[PDB]
Design a protein around this ligand. Structure first.
Ligand SMILES: *[C@@H]1O[C@H](CO)[C@@H](O[C@@H]2O[C@H](CO)[C@@H](O[C@@H]3O[C@H](CO)[C@@H](O)[C@H](O)[C@@H]3O)[C@H](O)[C@H]2NC(C)=O)[C@H](O)[C@H]1NC(C)=O
Ligand SMILES: *[C@@H]1O[C@H](CO)[C@@H](O[C@@H]2O[C@H](CO)[C@@H](O[C@@H]3O[C@H](CO)[C@@H](O)[C@H](O)[C@@H]3O)[C@H](O)[C@H]2NC(C)=O)[C@H](O)[C@H]1NC(C)=O
Ligand SMILES: *[C@@H]1O[C@H](CO)[C@@H](O[C@@H]2O[C@H](CO)[C@@H](O[C@@H]3O[C@H](CO)[C@@H](O)[C@H](O)[C@@H]3O)[C@H](O)[C@H]2NC(C)=O)[C@H](O)[C@H]1NC(C)=O
Ligand SMILES: *[C@@H]1O[C@H](CO)[C@@H](O)[C@H](O)[C@H]1NC(C)=O
Ligand SMILES: *[C@@H]1O[C@H](CO)[C@@H](O)[C@H](O)[C@H]1NC(C)=O
Ligand SMILES: *[C@@H]1O[C@H](CO)[C@@H](O)[C@H](O)[C@H]1NC(C)=O
Ligand SMILES: *[C@@H]1O[C@H](CO)[C@@H](O)[C@H](O)[C@H]1NC(C)=O
Ligand SMILES: *[C@@H]1O[C@H](CO)[C@@H](O)[C@H](O)[C@H]1NC(C)=O
Ligand SMILES: *[C@@H]1O[C@H](CO)[C@@H](O)[C@H](O)[C@H]1NC(C)=O
Ligand SMILES: *[C@@H]1O[C@H](CO)[C@@H](O)[C@H](O)[C@H]1NC(C)=O
Ligand SMILES: *[C@@H]1O[C@H](CO)[C@@H](O)[C@H](O)[C@H]1NC(C)=O
Ligand SMILES: *[C@@H]1O[C@H](CO)[C@@H](O)[C@H](O)[C@H]1NC(C)=O
Ligand SMILES: *[C@@H]1O[C@H](CO)[C@@H](O)[C@H](O)[C@H]1NC(C)=O
Ligand SMILES: *[C@@H]1O[C@H](CO)[C@@H](O)[C@H](O)[C@H]1NC(C)=O
Ligand SMILES: *[C@@H]1O[C@H](CO)[C@@H](O)[C@H](O)[C@H]1NC(C)=O
Ligand SMILES: *[C@@H]1O[C@H](CO)[C@@H](O)[C@H](O)[C@H]1NC(C)=O
Ligand SMILES: *[C@@H]1O[C@H](CO)[C@@H](O)[C@H](O)[C@H]1NC(C)=O
Ligand SMILES: *[C@@H]1O[C@H](CO)[C@@H](O)[C@H](O)[C@H]1NC(C)=O
Ligand SMILES: *[C@@H]1O[C@H](CO)[C@@H](O)[C@H](O)[C@H]1NC(C)=O
Ligand SMILES: *[C@@H]1O[C@H](CO)[C@@H](O)[C@H](O)[C@H]1NC(C)=O
Ligand SMILES: *[C@@H]1O[C@H](CO)[C@@H](O)[C@H](O)[C@H]1NC(C)=O
Ligand SMILES: *[C@@H]1O[C@H](CO)[C@@H](O)[C@H](O)[C@H]1NC(C)=O
Ligand SMILES: *[C@@H]1O[C@H](CO)[C@@H](O)[C@H](O)[C@H]1NC(C)=O
Ligand SMILES: *[C@@H]1O[C@H](CO)[C@@H](O)[C@H](O)[C@H]1NC(C)=O
Ligand SMILES: *[C@@H]1O[C@H](CO)[C@@H](O)[C@H](O)[C@H]1NC(C)=O
Ligand SMILES: *[C@@H]1O[C@H](CO)[C@@H](O)[C@H](O)[C@H]1NC(C)=O
Ligand SMILES: *[C@@H]1O[C@H](CO)[C@@H](O)[C@H](O)[C@H]1NC(C)=O
Ligand SMILES: *[C@@H]1O[C@H](CO)[C@@H](O)[C@H](O)[C@H]1NC(C)=O
Ligand SMILES: *[C@@H]1O[C@H](CO)[C@@H](O)[C@H](O)[C@H]1NC(C)=O
Ligand SMILES: *[C@@H]1O[C@H](CO)[C@@H](O)[C@H](O)[C@H]1NC(C)=O
Lengths: 368, 103, 116, 111, 417, 426
């Protein structure tokens, strides 16, 4: 009969906003606020919410912010301008079995005069009468040792006026009318682990095959396992390093296999196989502090690369310093089967498939 | 910290302060805080232009026109959630705002 | 919006619904600063109305009598021939007197309500 | 003056509550950050008064009885013989309780 | 009577605030003007306007400079080119003009490279240097960024309003008795020029002569026409661009030429120009004498940006000779003007900074509208110069910013409880 | 009875916020804000100068502001070359043997090609051997030339509270930095603090009004600094008696380096003069107050700064932009028991690792003509080393130079909302 206006109305809509992170690490200056000791999760009784892991701005937001932080770091580190010189170089015969090269060059000092001769080691992958790979194409910036890039867990938290909804349906395939929805203020740890073919650490399904338009196109399949597989990765070299002066306080630091747990890998595959029929970057990267690029040997022998073109970009090559002197497979990225992946958005779509951001709209009308 | 969920309209009438109190609590974050303030103020100004202020529940002398929803009072108020109601009347809202502003 | 701005105070006495309740409408730091200042101005005016004894209403009359020394004019001109622009100019440096008095009056009313 | 009579007793200081109420809103980035904070603090207090039955009053009466467990003194020992600084300390452990009760007292009036 | 408080009172004060840019939806103006964009007549309102004291002009001036720098800030530096340069000459099919022009220069940069320069880009001490090499190190403009002017609307923030004068005869100062309120100004194209003002507004009627003090004779006179004068400009030399790598992702764009070498130039009609001056003198005669003589002449002297018509089109920087214009005496077919070109540009009065304009591949065909002029017992008038503030004054001419003050009081027959 | 809500209640709590400055050059164009005390009757408040957040904030703002200036200035990295030098030894006093050197080197020019030969004078403190020399801080860090157009003269800075906050001031005449203060007032801004940078002695600060005040945290604990605020002042007359010239060298495309030029007339050693009798009375007052904590006729002796670097062991001035390091062992030489002028020699340095940092170095341009300054000693920084107690000049931690002015002020936040029992119900 009459119009009644309500203010604290329990209504929300799909929305896109900026979320913030909460907890000498690279993320130390980002995730500057701790999360609450009590997540205060609220079950929403009798609701249905449409969730979609695809076209999810939280994934896109995670991606762009990580790239930004990555680039905020490095920016203040030493620029390796004077390494683009002709390098003289020979082989290694010293207790080497079936590599690394023994190289030397003319380098600057802290003064503009008195150029010095320097001897250093390089991995074959980084050397192209030699030049360093891409030295004449892109600037190379070293990743200075004062900052750690260890992928600590992070939590995304809503700004005031927004809330994060979560899907608790154990059989959710990434899209659709999820029930048993709960509301949270912050996401779980979504540890920012970077990989290609296999997804490491993160969380388990406690197997679920999730993909967009499955069997119909050239799209990645994200497989989340109910059980983890431990992989034993090492670098049995006991490398040492040489610290030299490039310039006035400009320091440069000059200068492998994985054992897949036996039997359990075949059991894991056993869980995946014949589930696909219900519907129906050549290597596996890592970061141990070094980038392994391992072969899929007995999976469907690693090689360290020091000059890195990451995030699929060309002009921002990074120089990883040498390091003086144990991961879980929780999911796979497959293509029609062979390993797929290489797109960081899919790497980070995983673990966020269950979350949605909505805007709270505290105003509404009803009759009385 | 909204738990009304699928509870029907009128069940959430006692949680209105739960939602209201949750609204007020590098450059991107400064911008975000300013925007949160602006959102809050726009809703308060809007209630203020209408014939009320400082209320969780407001009822001014604007009659209901059933053309907006072909349901009776029991049919609208009960057996429905606020989310469902808002969808059914996602249109015919700006007109109410105008009538409320006029009175 | 400022329609009839040159009209008399009387004619404009019924046009206050306009130029009102519209201040929150939708390097780069200068724009962020502008948005913040718009909010500050909005709140400053609302607080001032709120500290005084009447707010919400576009027109509020109070218990502070009009003192003729603030104008030395009467209704043969005010609300008849004068415009709001001229009026604002005529009493432009008595504003702080009026405002102080309005606050004092409500503070007394608050005490009376506490005792009642 | 602002905080004038801060050492005066409760009820004496309150004769002029407009002074501490009208004066709350008064790289250079810090000035912008400061303006934003002042607004946020102001609005949080105004919202809190407005989530209770209070609005424009500086002396709002609400329908919540006083508990002897919060403080049990002669009325003359509240509105005399003590200032606001000690009082604020005396009941600092109950503020969040009283505020929750004030909010509900108003929800109970939405009839 | 009792004091009554009113809110929403339609009054205002003169004010200075921050305005925002808006438009009608890799252009720099567009990149940094991302807000899409009625008029209310004010009955019985008289408002004082002063376009010689207008903070909208000063704010626009600042915004233009700031945007320009933001645009060039991330572009490749040309520091590697400040080496002794070795230059000779070009005799390759050049017509009679431009003999002292297009020198062919080589660099010791290692690699040996070469490029062509305009004579105005270099100085001796076959031993040459680039201008703005000893001071004011040069930054190359990014080839992907367009500076082409687009209409810019300046808009008030909430709480503010822009008043504008509708009086067709307004001379820039004093009261205006036909006033309206807007949210945004009309679109203004941020066109840079000297002597002749291109692509602006036309006068509703006749010719309007404006100055701060007309009898001072040490102030610019801004002349607005009611009709446009068309100028047809060209640089018909089919230029080639030569890409030179100067570092790992850093490139220099050199002038690399097809066909005859011809003098760049601009044309106006004889009749249009003559009639245009006729109208201008009729109006000058309302302020300067009566039974007198008005003569026009070219610039008395100054730097290149003063004595020539600084003109920018296609992204090229031209310095056109206007002495073919302004050469007449007034009492009771076509004109062709030669133009010079530079690649090293000192924008405005920023002597301490310099920019390198990359060459344009192909040819330029350009048509512009003259909408106004800047001028400076018989009298003689000459084209003048300025710091660009005076150009913007011609479009921001009609507008004033005011702050709305919604609160006030008045005596009334009312007392509350 | 019933709960009543009061808004505008005059209460506060200790708080940490961001203050902004105001004022009546580095700071003159920084504050950009133009510049009344309210007494609080019957208010006792607790102050603690050693936990005062404004100290950390002042330090933070000074470092940031200092670095904001200098950043947009000419870098001198083109000068980190091998240079050759000889001693001047020309019309000197014989107290400067090897102190002033005549250096020459091959450096860059306007063009990337060619080169130029230049020469300049250097103080020994700026140059080290490697006749072959290197400049200091070409080793590590990088040298940036300060812009000559920028003055570093300290001017009073008034720190003002943001809306919602207030600053409380302690007026007790003998307040020693901690504990309850009886005479308390509220202000909107501080009195104006000059950001004077010095060590060992505190220059151009506020004076005690009644008697010398000895302030320290847990004074019984040795190896802590003691801040001594003096009653009256000691006037110091400093000079650098060398009529200098400058050489402007273009080192790139409008990039200028200002080199020390030659000297007009005789070369003389820099020094500072203090009245001897004034210093004698000043210390007698300090000793009498030290006896309150180190009493029972303990012999109190003063001794020099001993070891450590130049920044800590010598006194430091910034006069017109020139940087002086002075030997104070001639002042801190006495034994006190219960029963005309002093000349302090000085050295000049141009390459400065200011604020105890290692990643930055500033080059102080030379100053033409003859420069002198007169300063007021308003306090001392002492460190204490069982009888015959010994005190030495202490210092080097810049926060101690600000505590000496900020000790009277505290920041609080206003929380104007609370409840109390009343006789009303709705
Ligand atoms: C998956 O999670 C495991 C841990 O559950 C990650 O392995 C751990 O990685 C950290 C960082 O590299 C290791 O800590 C380091 O230890 C060395 C000394 O050996 C120390 O010098 C460093 O400062 C740092 O503290 C940690 O020891 C290692 N855990 C084990 C058992 O070795 C693993 O990296 C994660 N996988 C992926 C792909 O991120
Ligand atoms: C005054 O306004 C006129 C337009 O009303 C401006 O003329 C326009 O100038 C641009 C840039 O030189 C021309 O764009 C070019 O067009 C060719 C067409 O083949 C294209 O290949 C180029 O890539 C480029 O887009 C535009 O065509 C031209 N408009 C017309 C009608 O000819 C004039 O520049 C303005 N004057 C001043 C001084 O700003
Ligand atoms: C303590 O305060 C005194 C002033 O009371 C400071 O000395 C003054 O310092 C300024 C700047 O260095 C001197 O100004 C200059 O004077 C010359 C005179 O020829 C002029 O050419 C310059 O352009 C500039 O204006 C001022 O004369 C000087 N005052 C005295 C008495 O010499 C003193 O430096 C402060 N102490 C400390 C450590 O900062
Ligand atoms: C360094 O330069 C000298 C120049 O004679 C050359 O002979 C030598 O081979 C260079 N050394 C290296 C490692 O490139
Ligand atoms: C791997 O999975 C086991 C459970 O099967 C768990 O206890 C262990 O902590 C996991 N390791 C990592 C790196 O997550
Ligand atoms: C899946 O891909 C096929 C490709 O032909 C297309 O026809 C179909 O509509 C797509 N389905 C969905 C759900 O996108
Ligand atoms: C892999 O297995 C071989 C078997 O001989 C063993 O020697 C090696 O240490 C294992 N590697 C890791 C990382 O455990
Ligand atoms: C793994 O090793 C086999 C050895 O025959 C080789 O053929 C294959 O290409 C390798 N895979 C990758 C990704 O390098
Ligand atoms: C403002 O004060 C001056 C003081 O001389 C007075 O003459 C003037 O009339 C006052 N303004 C108004 C509007 O009365
Ligand atoms: C302080 O105490 C005296 C006691 O006589 C009283 O008169 C005075 O008003 C008190 N001060 C305040 C602020 O109330
Ligand atoms: C006082 O607190 C007790 C619980 O400790 C509660 O039961 C009682 O109702 C309260 N009384 C008042 C006046 O709120
Ligand atoms: C303008 O003034 C005239 C009298 O001078 C009056 O008749 C007319 O109505 C006024 N216009 C408006 C809009 O009130
Ligand atoms: C270039 O050649 C022309 C004739 O084609 C001559 O007039 C001019 O002086 C020559 N330039 C120089 C620098 O000699
Ligand atoms: C520098 O220019 C001269 C010109 O005669 C040339 O002979 C020499 O080879 C050039 N040097 C370099 C590095 O190109
Ligand atoms: C205002 O402009 C209109 C046309 O736009 C015209 O008819 C009217 O006479 C003008 N009034 C004044 C005061 O010039
Ligand atoms: C130039 O004048 C003509 C006159 O008809 C007009 O149509 C054209 O739009 C004008 N061009 C510009 C850029 O103002
Ligand atoms: C410009 O004004 C003159 C005045 O005599 C008139 O003859 C001419 O037609 C007008 N032209 C335009 C385009 O308004
Ligand atoms: C502009 O017109 C006004 C009209 O009152 C006149 O007073 C003023 O002197 C004129 N100014 C110029 C420069 O023509
Ligand atoms: C205008 O210029 C004349 C030049 O003689 C001068 O006397 C007069 O004061 C100036 N007037 C103004 C308003 O500037
Ligand atoms: C200018 O006029 C001349 C007359 O000979 C003609 O050849 C030339 O093409 C014209 N220029 C333009 C830009 O139209
Ligand atoms: C002299 O001025 C009058 C207007 O006052 C004008 O009509 C007349 O044409 C002018 N004479 C000349 C020669 O311009
Ligand atoms: C143009 O100016 C020059 C001096 O710069 C002068 O010699 C020449 O005669 C002028 N031309 C005309 C048409 O007045
Ligand atoms: C400059 O370099 C030349 C190279 O032969 C050397 O002889 C001379 O001594 C150097 N001069 C200086 C001041 O370093
Ligand atoms: C500065 O140079 C000397 C040369 O003997 C060296 O011992 C010292 O360690 C260097 N400074 C630093 C910080 O390494
Ligand atoms: C130094 O002390 C005297 C009083 O002895 C005082 O007048 C003078 O202003 C003080 N100078 C400074 C710089 O504070
Ligand atoms: C400062 O005064 C307090 C008063 O309680 C005392 O405890 C402390 O020891 C004194 N410290 C010094 C250095 O006098
Ligand atoms: C003060 O110093 C003495 C030195 O013996 C130490 O025992 C005591 O614990 C210290 N007290 C405080 C509060 O620091
Ligand atoms: C310092 O100079 C003043 C004159 O400005 C003089 O009176 C005073 O005695 C001098 N002090 C010393 C220690 O020489
Ligand atoms: C300083 O005090 C000592 C105490 O023994 C005395 O002998 C000496 O003469 C005094 N010096 C001055 C300048 O008064
Ligand atoms: C302190 O005095 C002793 C006396 O032998 C001397 O050796 C030492 O170098 C002096 N230290 C300072 C900093 O003056």
């Amino acid at each position: 009969l009459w119009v009644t206006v309500y203010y604290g109305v329990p209504v929300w809509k799909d929305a896109e906003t900026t979320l913030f992170c909460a907890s000498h690490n690279v993320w130390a200056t980002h995730c500057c606020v701790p999360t609450d000791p009590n997540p205060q999760e609220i079950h929403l009784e009798n609701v249905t919410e449409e969730f979609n892991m695809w076209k999810n701005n939280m994934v896109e937001q995670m991606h762009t912010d990580i790239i930004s932080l990555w680039d905020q770091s490095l920016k203040p580190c030493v620029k390796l301008t004077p390494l683009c010189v002709t390098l003289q170089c020979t082989n290694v015969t010293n207790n080497i079995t079936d590599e690394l090269k023994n190289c030397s060059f003319n380098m600057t000092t802290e003064l503009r005069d008195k150029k010095q001769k320097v001897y250093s080691l390089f991995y074959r992958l980084d050397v192209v009468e030699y030049r360093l790979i891409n030295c004449n194409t892109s600037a190379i910036t070293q990743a200075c040792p004062k900052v750690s890039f260890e992928p600590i867990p992070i939590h995304y938290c809503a700004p005031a006026g927004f809330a994060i909804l979560k899907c608790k349906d154990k059989k959710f395939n990434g899209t659709g009318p999820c029930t048993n929805v709960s509301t949270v203020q912050c996401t779980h740890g979504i540890k920012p682990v970077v990989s290609t073919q296999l997804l490491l650490n993160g969380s388990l399904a406690e197997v679920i095959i999730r993909s967009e338009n499955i069997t119909n196109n050239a799209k990645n399949i994200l497989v989340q396992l109910n059980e983890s597989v431990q992989i034993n990765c090492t670098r049995p070299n006991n490398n040492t390093r040489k610290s030299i002066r490039i310039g006035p306080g400009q320091w440069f630091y000059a200068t492998a296999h994985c054992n897949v747990s036996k039997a359990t890998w075949n059991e894991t595959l056993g869980k995946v196989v014949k589930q696909l029929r219900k519907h129906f970057v050549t290597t596996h990267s890592f970061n141990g502090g070094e980038f392994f690029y391992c072969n899929t040997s007995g999976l469907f022998p690693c090689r360290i690369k020091q000059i890195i073109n990451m995030w699929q970009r060309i002009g921002q090559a990074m120089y990883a310093p040498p390091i003086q002197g144990v991961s879980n497979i929780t999911g796979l990225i497959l293509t029609r089967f062979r390993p797929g992946g290489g797109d960081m958005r899919d790497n980070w779509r995983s673990e966020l498939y269950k979350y949605k951001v909505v805007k709270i709209e505290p105003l509404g009308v009803a009759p009385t | 910290f909204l738990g009304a969920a699928g509870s029907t309209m009128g069940a959430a009438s006692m949680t209105l302060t739960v939602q209201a109190r949750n609204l007020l609590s590098g450059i991107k974050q400064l911008q975000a805080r300013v925007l949160a303030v602006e959102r809050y103020l726009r809703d308060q100004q809007l209630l203020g232009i209408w014939g009320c202020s400082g209320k969780l529940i407001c009822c001014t002398n604007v009659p209901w026109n059933s053309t907006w929803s072909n349901r009776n009072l029991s049919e609208i108020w009960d057996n429905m959630t606020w989310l469902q109601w808002d969808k059914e009347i996602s249109n015919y809202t700006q007109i109410i705002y105008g009538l409320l502003e006029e009175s």
